[PDB]
Design a protein around this ligand. Structure first.
Ligand SMILES: [Cl-]
Ligand SMILES: [Cl-]
Lengths: 200, 198, 200
């Protein structure tokens, strides 16, 4: 009597909690992605200089002078470029926040066209500044990216974390691994090649 | 047997959990309000262009040319850009170097009443966060009823509601805060009971 | 109704999940709160708050930019002997966005070393622009801060809201009250002193 009814009520409560728990999960998840996007957006005027030798008492002024050198040696075409701030975070990466986004895009463009950006002979690496999340997503493609590279698919990663490669004289784009699992399911060649990596 | 114990402990857990959740609920909404604001703050210099025909292979420079076209065609008297990018043609987002610049564009667009591009009507709006715009729209119905009964309402930033109750202006961040308010004022409650979904 | 022992056993299991999922989602929530704290602070780096400035009926960027100059002319002459991206209201506060962070840093040190800042004689203030999370994070390190300070523990506040004091002849850092709890759980003297504050 009194006991049986107590049980049923509890079961309804537990389920209700499970439901409210779902709608909560969704909202949290939406905030996570919302943070990811805004982080990226805010880091748009930002460039990452990689492989730049560390220095003693490396203040803002020295950094700026360094960026100048990099520009004079690689693409002096530019220019004094407006720098809102520059700082350090294997040498520590250097983050550069340009006053105008246009300035960054132009420098990246200059780098990717040049190919080998160097500093006094030593190769360095200029790259976009991404959020932890986005940056992590890109790393997860890693394993697959290499296999594709190996088999001459000419893979490429672009914003946010899109994978792209050649399949049938056409370039294919994939936002996530799931979308890719669907693609290969109808192409035995790729399916066999990417069975383990995709965890299918 | 003596299940009374186990089933009682379960109920206790159940209660605990319902309180646990309510707390997390609070913190989540807090973060949601913080995102709304941070987005609003960031996109403050941004402006939204709707109804602009897509162009085959259109670089960012052509986008800027399209911007200047609209300025000449609608605002003769009237420009620094950090960026202008795309998102039925996609919305175009124009980010000005100064927030002031955006404000003058909207005023001119509102004083002109109608904005065109090559003879075709387009639209100029802000770039407020999705969470904000929706929020503002949700106060709509209630705002209409309050205006009707001469409460002199007002919707400000972010999406605060403010009207006159007892010769004293009151502010409401969300609908819930309003529900608790009317709980001690029968007449008002009776007025907004259908709108508050109570 | 003897099979009731069946249903109850499961309900106990369901509750265990709800608890796990509950704590796990909670961890994500905090990671989000912490993330917002981080990005809000970052975005505001080039900012300074002007507090106590008499507002007018109708203002604008230019009229405000002049007022900003009067403050410099009146308080820090050798400082202007100043690149401003934009300035505007949120008497409301006035958010001053500099072109270069280094600039903001400089003037802040000028306002802090002058101690007393005035506009036409009227006392005003220039302060760092910090997130609401960080502020309240510091505010949470309030009572606990006063207890250590009063008992001569040399407590300090390291940005963002890191609490640090000297015990056992060493210097410890603490991000959240939780970590501090883990610490005093083994220091009877300290524990007894910080039990009321940590709600322990
Ligand atoms: Cl929950
Ligand atoms: Cl959250």
């Amino acid at each position: 009597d009194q006991l049986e009814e107590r049980v049923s009520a509890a079961e309804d409560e537990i389920n209700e909690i499970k439901r409210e728990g779902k709608f909560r999960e969704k909202r949290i998840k939406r905030n996570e992605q919302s943070l990811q996007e805004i982080w990226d957006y805010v880091k748009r005027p930002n460039l990452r200089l990689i492989g730049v030798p560390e220095s003693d008492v490396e203040n803002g002024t020295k950094l700026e002078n360094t960026l100048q050198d990099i520009i004079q040696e690689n693409f002096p075409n530019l220019a004094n470029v407006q720098i809102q701030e520059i700082q350090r975070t294997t040498p520590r990466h250097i983050i550069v926040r340009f006053t105008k986004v246009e300035m960054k895009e132009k420098m990246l463009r200059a780098a990717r066209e040049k190919g080998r950006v160097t500093l006094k002979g030593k190769p360095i690496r200029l790259t976009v500044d991404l959020s932890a999340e986005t940056l992590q997503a890109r790393r997860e493609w890693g394993p697959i990216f290499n296999i594709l590279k190996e088999k001459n698919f000419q893979p490429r990663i672009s914003y946010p974390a899109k994978l792209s490669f050649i399949s049938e004289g056409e370039i294919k784009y994939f936002i996530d691994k799931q979308m890719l699992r669907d693609f290969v399911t109808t192409r035995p060649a790729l399916k066999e090649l990417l069975k383990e990596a995709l965890n299918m």
